Structures are given as C-alpha cells and as structure tokens.
Symmetry: none
Subunit: 226 residues, 6 copies
C-alpha cells in the first residue's frame, strides 16, 4: 500500500480528485450505491473505502471513524493519494428552536472545541469551509427541495459536549458534532477544499429518510465540484 493506514494505492483511485468522507462504513456503502460503477476497495480498522464514478469521473468514498484524530488520518492519506476536495456528510441534532427534524445544515465554519485542529493551525485560524463546496451543497440541497440552514457548527472531542451549550445557542450555533473542526481546519490551512452537510435527526424543539436525502445532497454536490 502507498499509505500507512487506508490500504490503498494511487492506482486504486483511478485519477479521483474528490472524496466523500462520512463517519461509518454503513454510510459509505449507501453513498457509493448512489453513484456509477461502485467498487469496494479496502477495509482496515475505521477506514472502509469505495471507488465510484460521477459523470465519468472517479470519486472516492471513505469512512473516517469517530473524532478529529481518526478523521485526520483518513484525510491526509487520501490527500497523499491525490484527493484535493473533501465533502463530509453526517446526521446530527440541532440546538436552535427554528430548526426542524428533516432540515439540512450546511456548515460555513466550525467552533474549534477539538484537539486535532490545533495540530494544523493555531486557534486564531478559522475552521472555515471552502466557498465552492459550500455553494455546491446549498445548490444541491435546493435542487431536491430540502429546507436548508447555512451557518456555524460546534465541534468537540466528547460525545457528551463541554469541557456552555446555551452559550453556543445564543451565538447562533446550529448544531454539534465531532469531526468538522478538524476536517475544515486541516483542509483550509493546507490548500484542500472541504465542505460539510448534515441532516437533522433530533432537536429541542422542532413540523433514515433524513439520512437518505443528506446522502443524495452530498453526492449531487460532488457532481458539481468535479
């Protein structure tokens, strides 16, 4: 293999320059299934990867595992293999009263409450998404009639956030997860494009289906970015 963890060679990518990077292998398979010529490439620890095609161009789908640290390995190794654009899709709760289950969130930038982002840039540097990617996600969401919110996501290392959430709600933060701060910071500080979308599956308060549409949205955004 060309890389330490993923079990992949450059040849495996067949010229791919974009990867979709969800957290788990189950989601990887569902995403790959939406595209042309899906082929499972490798599976080692947290990192299960598939190849597929959009408009005749190769695309990779690879799981990141849980948290910034695992994510940082997947993204670096995929970059080593030639990937220059990364789209993450997740499912999350929301912390704003006006956000409804089933809505789609596109992250412009993340609150850096993680540890791994600091390994790429000092805290002053913004965990900001690439403009082309963010645009493609919003456009894709619009094209399937999704109700979309665009804004800030809080990103931390703990499943049980905080070490405060009312503080983030008052500051307009949309939702919480664990990987976006690392992904966005490591890409924005290294000449790689990244975007982030999530389907809302819970909230206090707010009238697989949700995961399904978020998955379709990330694939259609990928198409626009080739």
């Amino acid at each position: 293999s060309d890389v330490f963890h993923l079990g992949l060679t450059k040849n495996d990518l067949q010229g791919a320059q974009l990867a979709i990077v969800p957290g788990d292998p189950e989601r990887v398979e569902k995403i790959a299934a939406l595209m042309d010529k899906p082929v499972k490439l490798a599976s080692h620890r947290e990192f299960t990867s598939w190849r597929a095609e959009l408009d005749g161009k190769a695309v990779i789908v690879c799981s990141t595992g849980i948290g910034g640290p695992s994510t940082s390995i997947a993204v670096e190794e995929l970059a080593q293999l030639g990937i220059r654009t990364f789209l993450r899709i997740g499912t999350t709760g929301a912390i704003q009263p006006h956000i409804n289950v089933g809505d789609v969130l596109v992250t412009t930038a993340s609150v850096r409450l993680d540890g791994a982002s600091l390994h790429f840039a000092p805290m002053e540097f913004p965990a900001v998404a690439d403009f082309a990617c963010t645009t493609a996600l919003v456009e894709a969401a619009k094209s399937i009639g999704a109700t979309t919110h665009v804004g800030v996501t809080a990103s931390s290392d703990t499943f049980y956030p905080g070490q405060s959430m009312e503080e983030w709600q008052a500051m307009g933060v949309m939702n919480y997860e664990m990987e976006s701060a690392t992904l966005l910071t490591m890409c924005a500080s290294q000449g790689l494009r990244a975007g982030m979308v999530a389907g809302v599956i819970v909230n206090r308060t707010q009238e697989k289906q949700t995961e399904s549409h978020a998955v379709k949205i990330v694939v259609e955004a990928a198409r626009r970015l080739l």
Copy 2:
C-alpha cells in the same frame, strides 16, 4: 442622537437595514454617489455617515475608522439603529505571489489576530462571513469581470509587527509573530487587514449578516511596484462590486 458616537437618530436611517462600511471617511461619499439620492447624514471623528437609496430602499454608508475597537463601536451603534447586514469594502495588500494588483479578494473567514473580537466570542468561534453576503459579493465581482480570490484573511491589531514588518523603528518582531507571515502564506491566507476579525465575529455571533470585499492595490511579495494608479481603478472597481452586492441583499 440615539447613539453615543455616530451622532445619528434612528429616523436618519429612514428604515435602512443594510450598511456599507469602509474604513476611511474619505471614501464614504464616493460610495454613496454610486446610488440614488446621496445625502450626508453626519460626521464625527472618523465616523462619516451618508444615506442613499438603492432600488427604492434606504442604504447607509458609514466609516469604521482603523482597528477593531473603533470598528466595534461603529458596528454596534449601527446595529442599534437597525442595521442587520454589513458589507465591508477596503483596499488591501496581498501576501500571495499569484495574487495581482487589481485583483479582488472576498473573505470567507479571518484569522483572529486582534483583541476586540474576544469580547464577542471566545477564540474557538470562527470569524466567519455570512453565506448570502459572500455569495452576493462573489457574484457581483464576476459580473464586472474582476479576477477574484475567495478565502481566508489575517486580521491584525497592528499594522507593523502583527503583519511581520521589520522596516520599523526597532526592527524587532516579538516571538509570537516571528516567522508568522511565512506560516500564513503556507496556509493559503490571502492578505492582512485590521478590522474584519471584529466585524465578522460580532456579526456572526449576534444574528447579523456580514461580508467583506477588498481590491488589491499592492503586493509586498512582488518586486514590481503598483502602477501610478496604485489605487484608483482598483478602488473604483471594489466600490462598484460592493454596491452591486448590496443590491442583491436588499
């Protein structure tokens, strides 16, 4: 007046909800002139305000002065007066060799090398621009055929050591900033300026929309010096872009 510094009442704004906010008072009238019915509202310190009209809606142009503390005052008072969308327009130097004089920069987020932003959100919070504003600015730039770069800006509380300038009285840069420019360059940072960390952080954390566009009038990494029109044509283009963006945000 209704606010401590701007010397404006709410009625002066005539229901305006978008402001264009350049740094320099001198540039205010020029921007207001591109629009309908330019009218000078007030002038106190470096806070010069004009009102104008765009597609039948009232718009404000108001200078911020230099630095985050001055900017925070302007922004907070304007927000008190009902402004909900802020478009920063500037001229700037670049720190990337491939960015040319005459190019336009649209900022998605800023490195927070300032102090005032910290009064609005902890450092972990991103100094991020509003998506609609950024989109409007990018589309307005495209509309006039400008060569546009979209990305990160470094926002510093100083013009000199925080921008790692050594051509100074002391010739010294404190440890924090020694080698910092090369690091920001490697991280793809486009340019330095002094106000956006405050503007973007306070807006993003307070339910307000903000964006920023700037024309490149110099590039310290290029040997060639800026043409005689070191500013003008580029300043004019940036102003055209910001007004056209505002038109899409009304």
Copy 3:
C-alpha cells in the same frame, strides 16, 4: 443493550471487572484466545468485544478504535458496565535510538497532546498510569525475558503533524510542533501513540486503574528497517505480557 455504542448489556460481562483494550478490532480475538473460554460478545463499528476467563474470573477484551474520542467512548461505556481496571496493549514505534525493535515499553505517564483528556481533567493533571497496573506489566515483561523500557509516552491527536512527520501532502508542520520531536527526545520520551492521554487521564481522575504496554515494531530514528516479522513475534509477546499482567490484577 445497556450502552450507546458497544452493544453490550451488563450481564454479557458476567461480572468482569478487568478489560484489556487494544486499538484494533482485528487483535481482539487473538488476545481472548490466550485465555479460557474465548467467546465473542459483540461487534459494532471498531468496537469488537470478547469475553474470556482467567483463573476462574471473567475478563473482557474490547477494541477502542483510533484516537481519544473513540477511546473515551469505549472506556466510559466499559466503566458503565462495571470495568474498573483497563490494560492498554499496542504496538508502537520508538523515538529513542537505543530502543530496539522487539523491545517492550511500559508507560508511567503520557504527554497530553490531545483534546479528549481535557474533558476529564484540566491540563495540569497528570496522564498517569495506576501503580499496580504498571507494576503488573513490568513484572509480566520481566517474566518472559523481554527487554523493557519504563517511562513517558507522547500521546497525540494526530498521526502526522503531532508526531512531526514531514513526509505528507503539505510537507508543513504547524509552529507548535516544529522541532517538537527533538524536544521530546531530549526529555526522554519513549514513543508516540494516540490514545493513552485520554485513557490514563480519564481513569486516574475517576477512581479507575489503567496501565499501558506496547511492543516496539519500528524505530524511525534507526536506519535499519524492521525484520520481515516487522510485527508478529513482537505483537505476540506484547499480548502474552498483557494477559499475564491481567492475571496479577484479578
């Protein structure tokens, strides 16, 4: 199940109070096999759990996955299920030239270059191993004739820049970590890994016992590359040591 991620109920553990926690699911069965009545309990994500029996007491083997966030989930859920003693077993590279492939490392405490540990204790708190666990591991290593090094490990939230690797896409390491490896080497740090700061800090601050042992399978400061058995014999020995240590902690 009784826990969010592991898919285990308390009864599955059969009163087990010690867990061996490797990183890689692949390594779980191999460890369980050294003991009595290996039985696969569950498998979800990178959390593969087996139960086994040692001297008539139930023992758990459960993978943590990569990094502190994954590890914290495994440890907290295992603790919810009654585990009070955690033995981490791994294979690792070394950063000291005198530490050889095939050697065994037992960690007394870790440098906290991660984020998840901070959710359990402020940075001032030491990522320290339990004395009984460390003693058990050191004695088990001695028992099989292993060449053993006992000391500090650096626990990083990244595999690449936090371990000051330059053979990367960007070839860049952020200021914080530039020259960091040479500093850790001078301070007598044995090796890098990615999970122990979280494991040790959360256990030491929550009344739980933890220790960590690892077999050296590579040394980036030595020119000679690891023998064809770059892992195997050493991986096998480390597993033997961790099981023998567990026997003394039951």
Copy 4:
C-alpha cells in the same frame, strides 16, 4: 510622505523628539494652542498632527484615534520620524470611591486587557510607564495645585469593559480606558519613553475645566522632558 499613514516627513518635525498623543483632533488643537508657534501639519484619517515649540524646541501633537490598533500606528510612525518620548493625556471615569471628579490620574502601569500590546511583548511583560515621564507628570500636576493619584489603569479594547470590574476595584485599579496598555507596552519594550495622565470627569462616587487642566499638565510635563 516618509511614513505610511501620518502624511509627514522627517523635515516636518524640525528636530522634534517628543510627541503628545491624545485620542482626538479637537484635543490636539487645544494642546497645541498652549505652546509656542503652533502649526497644523497634516490630517489623514484618525491622525491629525501639529507642530509647536516649548523652550525653543519642537514638539509634535498627534491624535491616535480609538484603541490600541490605531494608537500603535501613530506611535510607530512618529518613532520612525525621530520621536523618542510620548505623553498621552485623556479624560476618564474613576472606579475608586476616594477619587474625585477633577482629580488627575498619573498611570504607573496598565492592566493589559487589550490585543495590540501582545504584538509587542508577551503577557508577562509589564505595561509600565517610563520613570522620567511619570515623574514629570506628577511634578507638573503638583505645580498647578492639582489633586493627584498615581497608580494602575485598566486598559481594554471595548467601550463596554469586560471579556470583573469589582475585581479591578479590589485590586486598587484607578480607572479604565483603551489605549494605555498598548502605548506603554510598545514603548517600554522598544526603548521609547512614555507617560500617561488623565483628568477625572465621572465616578461612582466622588467634593471642560478638568480636560483643560489635564491638558496644561501634559504640556508642562513635556517641557520638563526636553
């Protein structure tokens, strides 16, 4: 011009080595009017400068604008032009019960709650005034019969301090403003002399006139420092 912002040349200074640096142009004019041969030199953005003379020696008066960032530009550029001693005068409130409106405060050092000071020295370094300048301000205040307090000032970036004031009161802090931390730190860490004086115009509680005497005090201190 010899400098990026102020619109001045070395020749404009006519050998001046001391500058008085208030915040606003109105105050600049009032200060210049107290001295001999006042001449307005330039006005660009926040920076309005005059030249004048004390005891036959040139002195500059130049506004700084609001906050450490603007102040840092004025001070650096004036240093480039040959200024080696800087005196700031302001008007402020007080936070100690024994300080009366009309009293004069001379700052020995400032609490560094700003951002710009960090661009000159790490937080451990004291934002301390020069001894000669502090002495000259106290002596000048005494010479006009002013009631004077000498001590610590809290200096921050916000008009609305804090991001606590009871904490500063309990620690003996006299008053609050926005520029002294930057001024004092950038001078004390760069071989420049600086001093700071302010007239008290409000307080809970404590029996243009106040601005007037503070202005006269800074001018008479300047005379002693030539």
Copy 5:
C-alpha cells in the same frame, strides 16, 4: 565551590549518585543521622547539605527550601555534581476521607499548579515519578508495616492553595504540597530519577512519630536504589 549556591565541590560528594532532598535543615540532620558516617558539608541560605553512607556508598542529604524555585536550584546543582537520583520526603495533610494521620503517601505524579515546572517542560508533559524510585518507596514502606497510599499529589506555589480543592478531591488527589511538581517534572524531563513520599500529619477527616517513619522509609528506599 563548583556550584553557584550550595557551596559544594564534586570531591565533597565522594562519588555519591543519590540525594535525599527534604525542605528544611532540621529534617536533613534527622535523615543523615539514620545513615552511616554522617558529615555536615555546608550551609548556605536555604541549602544545608550532609554526606553519609548506605551499604558503603556515599549519599547526600540536602534541604531545598520552600517552593519549586529554591528546589530547582538545589536539584540542578546537585545534578551538576553527579547526583542522578533524587528522593523527596515531606509531611503533609491529606484531602481524602479514607486517608489516616500516620499513613504514608507515595506520589506517582503531581498536578502541576506551580510556576517552576513550566521552566523545564510545557504543561502537557506529566510531572511523573520514576518507576524504580516509586517502587523502592512502596517496598520500604511495606517493610516497616506502614499503611500506604499510592497516587496523585497537587503541587502549587501558595501556602494557601488556589489561584477548587473539592475539584481535586473528586479527582482522587491525595494531598497538597509545593515542591513535587517542580522536582518530578525537572527530573523526568532531564534523565534524572525522582521519587516522593510524605507522612500524613493532618486530615478532615481520618483511627514527630509520623515524620520519623517517613524519614526511615526514604532512607530504606535510598538503600534499594544504590
């Protein structure tokens, strides 16, 4: 003298490679008295040193004075003279309800609430004891039938801790003192072995004698480490 503060030469040590480092000269004398051929070597400021012998090998006993700063001088200068292993003994209170007056505490690592430790390693580095030393202290305590607790100690610069203790109690911290963080960090980050033991003399709540046995324990641990 070979060193700046201690008033000692290499020759004075007669090949000693281990030092016992209590806080005060009174304790130094008591420790030396337990060993063979005790000889007082020097006394300068906080640093009173004796030489003695265990199993025919020279050992040094030297007071550190109060706090990390004084301790850091004693340890460095003794290292310069050839000492490679350092054992501290103290007497302290305890903050855990199950710890009884008269019990012995062996410190595995310290909470770094001091200033001097940062002069040797950044905060992320653990203030951890050497395994051989910790083992020798536990074994020595066992050999005289002492009730022993092994774990974490909080170490700060103030006699009056905090600038919170319930926080440390909840985290399992055994006790508080002022020197261990510096000692352990400076040794663990510089290739020197160090251990720490203390006799419990007070606690809420928990059924010279205590100092006496802790002193005997450190001497018997020293013997095991030669």
Copy 6:
C-alpha cells in the same frame, strides 16, 4: 507568635510599618546595623528578622529566602503584622552590556516569569513598583553618587532555564525560554532575579507599597570578570541606598 512562619508577634515590631526585605538572612544584621538600636527579633528557616529605629520610628529588616513562594510567605506575614511599605534590596547580575559592575538598578516593574504572583493577580496585571518607593530609591541613589539605571527587571521562578543558562547538567532549555534572553535584552530588560514579580504584584494589588533596588555585582554579557570585591563595595552601597530611601518613606 502571631504568624505561622516568622515567629513574630505584633508587639515585636513596636508599631513598625516599613520593612526592608533582603533575600539572604546573612545580610539582615548588616542592614539593621546602619540604623539605630539594632535588635535581633527572631530567626526561623531563612526568615531572620531584626528591628531597628530610623529617625525615631521602628523599622523591620527581614529576609525572604529564595523565590516567590518563600517571598509570598514573608510578605503576607509581615503585612499581617502591620507592614505597609516593603523595600527589596538585592545584588544582581545584569544582561545589558552598558550596565557596569558597581552600578545600581531601581526596578519600575517586572516581567512575571514566575507562578506565585498569579495567586494574587491575573497575568494581565502589572508587577509594578509603588511610585513613592521608586522615587525614594532613585533619589537615595543619586544622593550617594551611584550610577543608576531605572527600568524593567525579569523575575524568574528558576535560576537556570528561566534565565536561559546552558551551562547546566542537561544543557537544554525548554522551548518557552530558548532565545528568551536575547528578546528581553532587545526589550530593554536590565537584569534577572527571582522574587520581585511576587513581591510587586502582591503589594500593588493589596494596597501596599513596594520598591526594589539592587547593586550589580556581575554582568554575564561582559568579558571582564568582577573585581576581587565582586560584591562588597557594591553590596555596601546598595544597603546604604535602601536605608536612605526608607528614611524618606517613614
């Protein structure tokens, strides 16, 4: 006694409200002797206290020992006993080439490279000397014809790495302090010592007056070594200055 460490009662001080506080017990009697009716009060650890009389007022001389933690104990107990003015007297090395052996340093404020000061005020607070004390010390120095430097001192929790000394067992200085001496030199810092950050911060934040004077007895940036009287004449002069300053503060 009324205090935990000094072994003094309030009556021992006889209403004294000024203390001279050298580091070394050895130097206490010598200072007390310059004044009227030197009387040894007590001696515990490195806390030797004498009482004396100056112009008919009781004055205390009491050693602090080495470092901020020891100093904080002495200062807080002395303040408990009614001392409101503290004058630190020391001998020191310089780090500026133009500062000569025999010169006198009066400290306006200190760089806080210690830990104990942080228990009294956050780092943002200045370790600043009282104006009356500093004035008294500067005038007393002038009175005896001393060559005097007035300015910033760096106050470190260590003698070795915090003063960037490499002539040590390890020969290593941690990143924080690598290149730090050259930085303090460029910033005009006069010298290093180990007690003033604590002394000045605790006094300035607690309504107490403090100042510090020191005689230069060595300069590590000069090739020439200090004369045989490497200390004496200079130590004597510094003591004369501190007593004369105290006379003006009574």
